[PDB]
Enzyme design. Structure first.
Site, PDB file in Angstrom:
ATOM      1  N   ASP A  94     -49.261 -57.613 -50.140  1.00 55.78           N
ATOM      2  CA  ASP A  94     -47.832 -57.778 -50.388  1.00 55.78           C
ATOM      3  C   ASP A  94     -47.009 -56.704 -49.690  1.00 55.78           C
ATOM      4  OD1 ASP A  94     -45.265 -58.285 -51.405  1.00 55.78           O
ATOM      5  OD2 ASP A  94     -45.782 -57.754 -53.470  1.00 55.78           O
ATOM      6  N   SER A 154     -32.411 -59.483 -38.180  1.00 51.20           N
ATOM      7  CA  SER A 154     -32.552 -60.609 -37.269  1.00 51.20           C
ATOM      8  C   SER A 154     -31.261 -60.794 -36.489  1.00 51.20           C
ATOM      9  CB  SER A 154     -32.894 -61.888 -38.046  1.00 51.20           C
ATOM     10  OG  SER A 154     -32.987 -63.009 -37.178  1.00 51.20           O
TER      11      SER A 154
HETATM   12  O1  LIG Z   1     -47.366 -65.229 -55.598  1.00 54.33           O
HETATM   13  C1  LIG Z   1     -48.043 -64.251 -56.371  1.00 54.33           C
HETATM   14  C2  LIG Z   1     -47.168 -63.078 -56.648  1.00 54.33           C
HETATM   15  C3  LIG Z   1     -46.792 -62.467 -57.781  1.00 54.33           C
HETATM   16  C4  LIG Z   1     -45.967 -61.383 -57.420  1.00 54.33           C
HETATM   17  C5  LIG Z   1     -45.875 -61.374 -56.084  1.00 54.33           C
HETATM   18  C6  LIG Z   1     -45.158 -60.520 -55.126  1.00 54.33           C
HETATM   19  N1  LIG Z   1     -43.952 -61.230 -54.591  1.00 54.33           N
HETATM   20  C7  LIG Z   1     -42.966 -61.680 -55.623  1.00 54.33           C
HETATM   21  C8  LIG Z   1     -41.480 -61.648 -55.084  1.00 54.33           C
HETATM   22  O2  LIG Z   1     -41.165 -60.257 -55.080  1.00 54.33           O
HETATM   23  C9  LIG Z   1     -40.468 -62.329 -56.063  1.00 54.33           C
HETATM   24  N2  LIG Z   1     -39.115 -62.638 -55.401  1.00 54.33           N
HETATM   25  C10 LIG Z   1     -39.208 -63.770 -54.416  1.00 54.33           C
HETATM   26  C11 LIG Z   1     -37.845 -64.063 -53.841  1.00 54.33           C
HETATM   27  O3  LIG Z   1     -36.915 -64.389 -54.860  1.00 54.33           O
HETATM   28  C12 LIG Z   1     -36.757 -63.282 -55.736  1.00 54.33           C
HETATM   29  C13 LIG Z   1     -38.055 -62.937 -56.424  1.00 54.33           C
HETATM   30  C14 LIG Z   1     -41.145 -63.615 -56.609  1.00 54.33           C
HETATM   31  O4  LIG Z   1     -41.741 -63.378 -57.875  1.00 54.33           O
HETATM   32  C15 LIG Z   1     -43.154 -63.221 -57.656  1.00 54.33           C
HETATM   33  C16 LIG Z   1     -43.270 -63.128 -56.147  1.00 54.33           C
HETATM   34  O5  LIG Z   1     -42.198 -64.003 -55.744  1.00 54.33           O
HETATM   35  O6  LIG Z   1     -46.610 -62.423 -55.568  1.00 54.33           O
END
Ligand SMILES: OCc1ccc(CN[C@H]2[C@H](O)[C@@H](N3CCOCC3)[C@@H]3OC[C@H]2O3)o1
Length: 330
Positions: free
Chosen positions: A35, A199
Protein backbone atom coordinates in the site's frame (compact mmCIF):
# COMPACT_ATOMS: atom_id res chain seq x y z
CA UNK A 1 20.72 -5.92 -2.64
CA UNK A 2 17.47 -6.32 -4.57
CA UNK A 3 14.10 -8.04 -4.18
CA UNK A 4 11.44 -9.12 -6.65
CA UNK A 5 7.98 -10.47 -5.82
CA UNK A 6 4.91 -11.37 -7.85
CA UNK A 7 1.73 -9.50 -7.00
CA UNK A 8 -1.68 -11.04 -7.79
CA UNK A 9 -5.26 -9.72 -8.00
CA UNK A 10 -7.39 -11.07 -5.14
CA UNK A 11 -10.38 -11.60 -7.45
CA UNK A 12 -11.60 -11.34 -11.06
CA UNK A 13 -12.15 -7.58 -10.84
CA UNK A 14 -8.69 -6.61 -9.57
CA UNK A 15 -10.27 -5.25 -6.39
CA UNK A 16 -6.86 -5.44 -4.70
CA UNK A 17 -3.46 -7.10 -5.12
CA UNK A 18 -1.62 -9.42 -2.74
CA UNK A 19 2.09 -10.14 -2.50
CA UNK A 20 3.68 -12.97 -0.47
CA UNK A 21 5.81 -11.80 2.46
CA UNK A 22 8.00 -13.94 4.74
CA UNK A 23 7.87 -13.01 8.44
CA UNK A 24 9.82 -14.49 11.32
CA UNK A 25 12.02 -17.54 11.91
CA UNK A 26 11.15 -20.03 10.57
CA UNK A 27 9.38 -18.02 7.88
CA UNK A 28 5.64 -17.50 8.15
CA UNK A 29 4.36 -16.49 4.73
CA UNK A 30 1.47 -14.04 4.63
CA UNK A 31 -0.17 -12.47 1.60
CA UNK A 32 -0.08 -8.72 2.12
CA UNK A 33 -1.64 -5.74 0.37
CA UNK A 34 1.30 -3.50 -0.65
CA UNK A 35 0.00 0.00 0.00
CA UNK A 36 1.85 3.08 -1.23
CA UNK A 37 -0.83 5.16 0.51
CA UNK A 38 0.05 4.15 4.08
CA UNK A 39 3.09 3.39 6.22
CA UNK A 40 2.20 0.57 8.59
CA UNK A 41 3.06 -3.08 8.14
CA UNK A 42 0.24 -4.87 9.99
CA UNK A 43 -0.92 -8.46 9.99
CA UNK A 44 -3.69 -10.79 11.08
CA UNK A 45 -2.26 -12.69 14.04
CA UNK A 46 -2.61 -15.24 16.81
CA UNK A 47 -3.71 -12.25 18.91
CA UNK A 48 -6.61 -11.25 16.68
CA UNK A 49 -10.05 -11.73 18.24
CA UNK A 50 -11.07 -15.21 17.10
CA UNK A 51 -14.49 -14.15 15.80
CA UNK A 52 -12.76 -11.59 13.58
CA UNK A 53 -10.64 -14.15 11.74
CA UNK A 54 -12.32 -15.96 8.84
CA UNK A 55 -9.90 -17.66 6.45
CA UNK A 56 -6.86 -15.40 6.75
CA UNK A 57 -3.36 -16.71 7.38
CA UNK A 58 -2.12 -15.45 10.75
CA UNK A 59 1.27 -14.45 12.14
CA UNK A 60 2.08 -16.20 15.40
CA UNK A 61 4.91 -14.22 17.04
CA UNK A 62 5.36 -16.84 19.78
CA UNK A 63 6.48 -19.31 17.07
CA UNK A 64 9.16 -16.94 15.74
CA UNK A 65 12.54 -17.19 17.44
CA UNK A 66 13.44 -13.74 16.11
CA UNK A 67 10.24 -11.97 17.25
CA UNK A 68 10.63 -9.44 20.08
CA UNK A 69 7.73 -7.56 21.67
CA UNK A 70 8.21 -3.82 21.30
CA UNK A 71 7.51 -2.74 24.88
CA UNK A 72 4.57 -0.38 25.33
CA UNK A 73 4.00 0.08 21.59
CA UNK A 74 0.50 0.05 20.10
CA UNK A 75 -1.04 0.98 16.78
CA UNK A 76 -4.47 1.89 15.47
CA UNK A 77 -5.55 2.72 11.92
CA UNK A 78 -8.80 3.99 10.46
CA UNK A 79 -9.44 3.85 6.72
CA UNK A 80 -11.74 6.03 4.62
CA UNK A 81 -14.15 3.18 3.90
CA UNK A 82 -14.89 3.11 7.62
CA UNK A 83 -12.74 0.03 8.17
CA UNK A 84 -10.13 -0.23 10.90
CA UNK A 85 -7.56 -2.35 12.69
CA UNK A 86 -5.40 -2.05 15.82
CA UNK A 87 -3.06 -3.99 18.10
CA UNK A 88 0.47 -4.30 19.47
CA UNK A 89 3.92 -4.41 17.88
CA UNK A 90 6.79 -6.85 17.44
CA UNK A 91 10.11 -6.47 15.68
CA UNK A 92 10.99 -9.44 13.45
CA UNK A 93 12.75 -10.45 10.25
CA UNK A 94 10.75 -9.62 7.12
CA UNK A 95 11.62 -10.69 3.59
CA UNK A 96 10.05 -9.74 0.26
CA UNK A 97 11.13 -11.64 -2.83
CA UNK A 98 14.64 -12.32 -1.56
CA UNK A 99 15.20 -8.93 0.08
CA UNK A 100 15.57 -9.17 3.86
CA UNK A 101 15.13 -6.63 6.67
CA UNK A 102 15.94 -7.50 10.28
CA UNK A 103 14.21 -5.70 13.13
CA UNK A 104 11.23 -4.63 11.06
CA UNK A 105 8.23 -3.41 13.04
CA UNK A 106 5.47 -5.97 12.49
CA UNK A 107 2.19 -4.63 13.79
CA UNK A 108 0.11 -7.51 15.13
CA UNK A 109 -3.67 -7.03 14.98
CA UNK A 110 -5.75 -7.50 18.12
CA UNK A 111 -8.83 -6.14 16.35
CA UNK A 112 -9.95 -5.78 12.75
CA UNK A 113 -13.25 -4.44 11.40
CA UNK A 114 -15.81 -6.51 9.51
CA UNK A 115 -14.56 -5.65 6.01
CA UNK A 116 -11.18 -7.18 6.81
CA UNK A 117 -12.78 -10.25 8.38
CA UNK A 118 -15.02 -10.72 5.33
CA UNK A 119 -12.06 -10.68 2.95
CA UNK A 120 -10.22 -13.97 3.41
CA UNK A 121 -7.59 -13.19 0.74
CA UNK A 122 -5.75 -10.34 2.50
CA UNK A 123 -3.63 -11.23 5.53
CA UNK A 124 -2.58 -7.64 6.22
CA UNK A 125 -1.00 -4.54 4.71
CA UNK A 126 2.56 -3.51 3.93
CA UNK A 127 2.83 0.27 3.77
CA UNK A 128 5.13 2.01 1.29
CA UNK A 129 4.31 5.68 1.87
CA UNK A 130 6.62 7.89 3.90
CA UNK A 131 7.39 6.87 7.47
CA UNK A 132 5.95 10.13 8.88
CA UNK A 133 2.52 8.49 8.51
CA UNK A 134 3.33 5.43 10.65
CA UNK A 135 0.80 5.13 13.46
CA UNK A 136 2.87 3.30 16.09
CA UNK A 137 2.77 5.02 19.49
CA UNK A 138 4.56 6.23 21.52
CA UNK A 139 7.50 5.67 19.17
CA UNK A 140 6.85 5.88 15.41
CA UNK A 141 8.33 3.00 13.37
CA UNK A 142 9.90 2.79 9.91
CA UNK A 143 8.48 1.21 6.74
CA UNK A 144 9.98 -1.86 5.10
CA UNK A 145 11.29 0.29 2.27
CA UNK A 146 12.84 2.84 4.62
CA UNK A 147 14.58 0.05 6.51
CA UNK A 148 15.84 -1.61 3.30
CA UNK A 149 16.76 1.62 1.47
CA UNK A 150 20.44 1.97 2.36
CA UNK A 151 21.19 -1.63 1.38
CA UNK A 152 19.43 -1.51 -2.00
CA UNK A 153 21.47 -1.24 -5.20
CA UNK A 154 19.36 1.86 -5.90
CA UNK A 155 16.95 3.50 -3.41
CA UNK A 156 13.84 2.66 -5.45
CA UNK A 157 10.95 0.29 -5.81
CA UNK A 158 8.70 -0.25 -8.81
CA UNK A 159 5.06 -1.26 -9.16
CA UNK A 160 4.01 -3.24 -12.22
CA UNK A 161 0.37 -4.18 -11.58
CA UNK A 162 -1.44 -6.45 -14.02
CA UNK A 163 -4.89 -6.08 -15.55
CA UNK A 164 -6.63 -9.35 -14.69
CA UNK A 165 -3.15 -10.87 -14.52
CA UNK A 166 -0.13 -11.18 -12.23
CA UNK A 167 2.40 -8.40 -11.90
CA UNK A 168 5.56 -7.49 -10.04
CA UNK A 169 6.99 -5.40 -7.21
CA UNK A 170 10.76 -4.89 -7.52
CA UNK A 171 13.03 -3.35 -4.89
CA UNK A 172 16.40 -1.77 -5.64
CA UNK A 173 16.42 -1.88 -9.43
CA UNK A 174 14.56 -0.87 -12.56
CA UNK A 175 13.72 -3.70 -14.98
CA UNK A 176 14.19 -2.02 -18.34
CA UNK A 177 12.46 -4.90 -20.11
CA UNK A 178 9.19 -4.26 -18.24
CA UNK A 179 8.07 -1.16 -20.12
CA UNK A 180 8.09 0.46 -23.54
CA UNK A 181 9.53 3.85 -24.48
CA UNK A 182 11.02 5.97 -21.68
CA UNK A 183 10.20 6.58 -18.04
CA UNK A 184 9.01 10.14 -17.45
CA UNK A 185 9.89 11.39 -13.98
CA UNK A 186 7.80 13.97 -12.17
CA UNK A 187 8.16 15.90 -8.88
CA UNK A 188 6.87 14.55 -5.58
CA UNK A 189 5.67 16.40 -2.51
CA UNK A 190 6.04 14.47 0.72
CA UNK A 191 4.40 17.17 2.82
CA UNK A 192 1.34 14.98 3.50
CA UNK A 193 3.42 11.80 3.73
CA UNK A 194 2.18 10.49 0.37
CA UNK A 195 3.69 9.92 -3.04
CA UNK A 196 1.93 13.11 -4.08
CA UNK A 197 2.43 14.50 -7.59
CA UNK A 198 0.74 16.71 -10.19
CA UNK A 199 -0.69 15.30 -13.39
CA UNK A 200 -0.58 17.66 -16.36
CA UNK A 201 -4.11 16.83 -17.55
CA UNK A 202 -6.37 14.30 -19.23
CA UNK A 203 -8.26 13.08 -22.30
CA UNK A 204 -11.39 10.99 -22.67
CA UNK A 205 -11.24 8.38 -25.46
CA UNK A 206 -9.93 9.90 -28.69
CA UNK A 207 -10.89 13.34 -27.38
CA UNK A 208 -8.80 16.50 -27.13
CA UNK A 209 -6.24 16.54 -24.31
CA UNK A 210 -7.13 19.00 -21.56
CA UNK A 211 -4.08 20.68 -19.99
CA UNK A 212 -4.92 21.14 -16.33
CA UNK A 213 -3.05 20.51 -13.10
CA UNK A 214 -4.39 17.59 -11.10
CA UNK A 215 -2.72 17.11 -7.74
CA UNK A 216 -3.06 13.58 -6.41
CA UNK A 217 -1.34 10.56 -4.90
CA UNK A 218 0.05 7.37 -6.42
CA UNK A 219 -1.76 4.81 -4.25
CA UNK A 220 -1.45 1.08 -4.89
CA UNK A 221 -3.71 0.44 -1.90
CA UNK A 222 -6.72 2.09 -3.52
CA UNK A 223 -8.69 0.20 -6.17
CA UNK A 224 -10.18 2.97 -8.27
CA UNK A 225 -9.20 6.24 -9.90
CA UNK A 226 -10.58 9.22 -7.97
CA UNK A 227 -10.52 12.55 -9.82
CA UNK A 228 -12.21 15.99 -9.66
CA UNK A 229 -15.97 16.04 -10.24
CA UNK A 230 -15.56 18.05 -13.44
CA UNK A 231 -13.19 15.47 -14.93
CA UNK A 232 -15.27 12.50 -13.85
CA UNK A 233 -18.42 14.09 -15.31
CA UNK A 234 -16.57 14.62 -18.59
CA UNK A 235 -15.61 10.95 -18.66
CA UNK A 236 -19.02 9.40 -17.94
CA UNK A 237 -20.75 11.83 -20.34
CA UNK A 238 -19.15 9.70 -23.07
CA UNK A 239 -20.88 6.54 -21.84
CA UNK A 240 -24.49 6.20 -22.94
CA UNK A 241 -26.78 5.61 -19.97
CA UNK A 242 -24.13 6.22 -17.29
CA UNK A 243 -25.43 8.04 -14.21
CA UNK A 244 -24.20 9.01 -10.76
CA UNK A 245 -26.20 7.01 -8.23
CA UNK A 246 -26.53 8.11 -4.59
CA UNK A 247 -27.79 4.71 -3.46
CA UNK A 248 -24.93 2.84 -5.13
CA UNK A 249 -22.39 5.51 -4.17
CA UNK A 250 -20.99 6.66 -7.48
CA UNK A 251 -21.23 6.42 -11.22
CA UNK A 252 -22.77 3.29 -12.68
CA UNK A 253 -23.28 2.37 -16.33
CA UNK A 254 -25.08 -0.23 -18.49
CA UNK A 255 -23.00 -3.41 -18.48
CA UNK A 256 -23.50 -3.63 -22.28
CA UNK A 257 -21.64 -0.35 -22.80
CA UNK A 258 -18.28 -0.03 -24.51
CA UNK A 259 -16.15 2.12 -22.21
CA UNK A 260 -13.85 4.80 -23.65
CA UNK A 261 -10.20 4.94 -22.61
CA UNK A 262 -8.92 7.55 -20.15
CA UNK A 263 -5.57 9.28 -20.62
CA UNK A 264 -3.66 11.12 -17.92
CA UNK A 265 -0.58 13.28 -18.34
CA UNK A 266 2.83 12.87 -16.75
CA UNK A 267 4.79 15.92 -17.84
CA UNK A 268 4.64 15.79 -21.63
CA UNK A 269 4.07 12.03 -21.56
CA UNK A 270 0.73 10.27 -21.69
CA UNK A 271 -0.55 7.15 -19.95
CA UNK A 272 -3.59 5.51 -21.56
CA UNK A 273 -5.97 3.51 -19.39
CA UNK A 274 -7.93 1.11 -21.66
CA UNK A 275 -11.67 1.36 -21.25
CA UNK A 276 -12.13 -2.15 -19.89
CA UNK A 277 -9.86 -1.26 -16.93
CA UNK A 278 -12.68 1.04 -15.82
CA UNK A 279 -15.31 -1.74 -15.61
CA UNK A 280 -15.86 -3.15 -12.12
CA UNK A 281 -18.80 -5.35 -12.98
CA UNK A 282 -22.42 -5.68 -11.83
CA UNK A 283 -23.32 -3.64 -8.76
CA UNK A 284 -24.94 -6.78 -7.33
CA UNK A 285 -24.97 -10.35 -8.60
CA UNK A 286 -27.13 -10.65 -11.70
CA UNK A 287 -27.54 -6.91 -12.21
CA UNK A 288 -27.11 -5.33 -15.64
CA UNK A 289 -25.90 -2.13 -13.98
CA UNK A 290 -22.09 -1.99 -13.62
CA UNK A 291 -19.88 0.01 -11.28
CA UNK A 292 -17.47 2.55 -12.74
CA UNK A 293 -13.76 2.58 -12.01
CA UNK A 294 -13.39 6.34 -12.28
CA UNK A 295 -15.14 8.19 -9.45
CA UNK A 296 -15.31 11.70 -7.97
CA UNK A 297 -12.77 12.71 -5.31
CA UNK A 298 -15.00 15.57 -4.12
CA UNK A 299 -15.85 13.85 -0.82
CA UNK A 300 -12.26 12.74 -0.19
CA UNK A 301 -10.26 15.97 -0.28
CA UNK A 302 -7.51 14.59 -2.47
CA UNK A 303 -7.26 12.95 -5.88
CA UNK A 304 -6.17 9.34 -5.92
CA UNK A 305 -4.32 7.57 -8.69
CA UNK A 306 -5.30 4.10 -7.53
CA UNK A 307 -4.83 0.73 -9.22
CA UNK A 308 -7.08 1.60 -12.18
CA UNK A 309 -4.49 4.19 -13.24
CA UNK A 310 -1.33 2.59 -11.94
CA UNK A 311 -1.93 -0.80 -13.62
CA UNK A 312 -1.79 1.00 -16.99
CA UNK A 313 1.82 1.94 -16.28
CA UNK A 314 5.22 0.81 -15.06
CA UNK A 315 5.65 2.99 -11.97
CA UNK A 316 8.93 3.96 -10.29
CA UNK A 317 8.83 5.06 -6.68
CA UNK A 318 12.19 6.83 -6.48
CA UNK A 319 13.24 7.24 -2.85
CA UNK A 320 16.37 9.32 -3.46
CA UNK A 321 17.16 12.23 -1.12
CA UNK A 322 14.64 14.19 -3.16
CA UNK A 323 11.96 11.60 -4.04
CA UNK A 324 10.33 11.49 -7.49
CA UNK A 325 7.84 9.34 -9.37
CA UNK A 326 8.39 7.74 -12.75
CA UNK A 327 5.74 6.55 -15.23
CA UNK A 328 6.18 4.55 -18.40
CA UNK A 329 3.72 2.86 -20.74
CA UNK A 330 3.99 -0.91 -21.00
O1 LIG B 1 -8.54 -3.14 -0.16
C1 LIG B 1 -8.00 -3.55 1.09
C2 LIG B 1 -7.64 -2.38 1.93
C3 LIG B 1 -7.97 -2.01 3.18
C4 LIG B 1 -7.30 -0.80 3.46
C5 LIG B 1 -6.58 -0.48 2.37
C6 LIG B 1 -5.70 0.65 2.04
N1 LIG B 1 -6.39 1.59 1.11
C7 LIG B 1 -7.69 2.16 1.61
C8 LIG B 1 -7.94 3.63 1.08
O2 LIG B 1 -7.05 4.41 1.87
C9 LIG B 1 -9.38 4.14 1.41
N2 LIG B 1 -9.77 5.39 0.59
C10 LIG B 1 -10.00 5.07 -0.86
C11 LIG B 1 -10.43 6.32 -1.59
O3 LIG B 1 -11.60 6.87 -1.03
C12 LIG B 1 -11.35 7.26 0.31
C13 LIG B 1 -10.97 6.07 1.17
C14 LIG B 1 -10.36 2.96 1.15
O4 LIG B 1 -10.67 2.28 2.35
C15 LIG B 1 -9.88 1.08 2.37
C16 LIG B 1 -8.92 1.27 1.21
O5 LIG B 1 -9.75 2.01 0.30
O6 LIG B 1 -6.77 -1.44 1.40
Amino acid sequence: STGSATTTPIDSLDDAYITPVQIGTPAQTLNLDFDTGSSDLWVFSSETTASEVDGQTIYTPSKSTTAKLLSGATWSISYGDGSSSSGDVYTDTVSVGGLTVTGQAVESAKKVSSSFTEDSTIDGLLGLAFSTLNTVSPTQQKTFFDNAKASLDSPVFTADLGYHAPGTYNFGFIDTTAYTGSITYTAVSTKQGFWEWTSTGYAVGSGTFKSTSIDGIADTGTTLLYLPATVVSAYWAQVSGAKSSSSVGGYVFPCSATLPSFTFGVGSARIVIPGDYIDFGPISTGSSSCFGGIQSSAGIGINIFGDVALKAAFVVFNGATTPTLGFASK
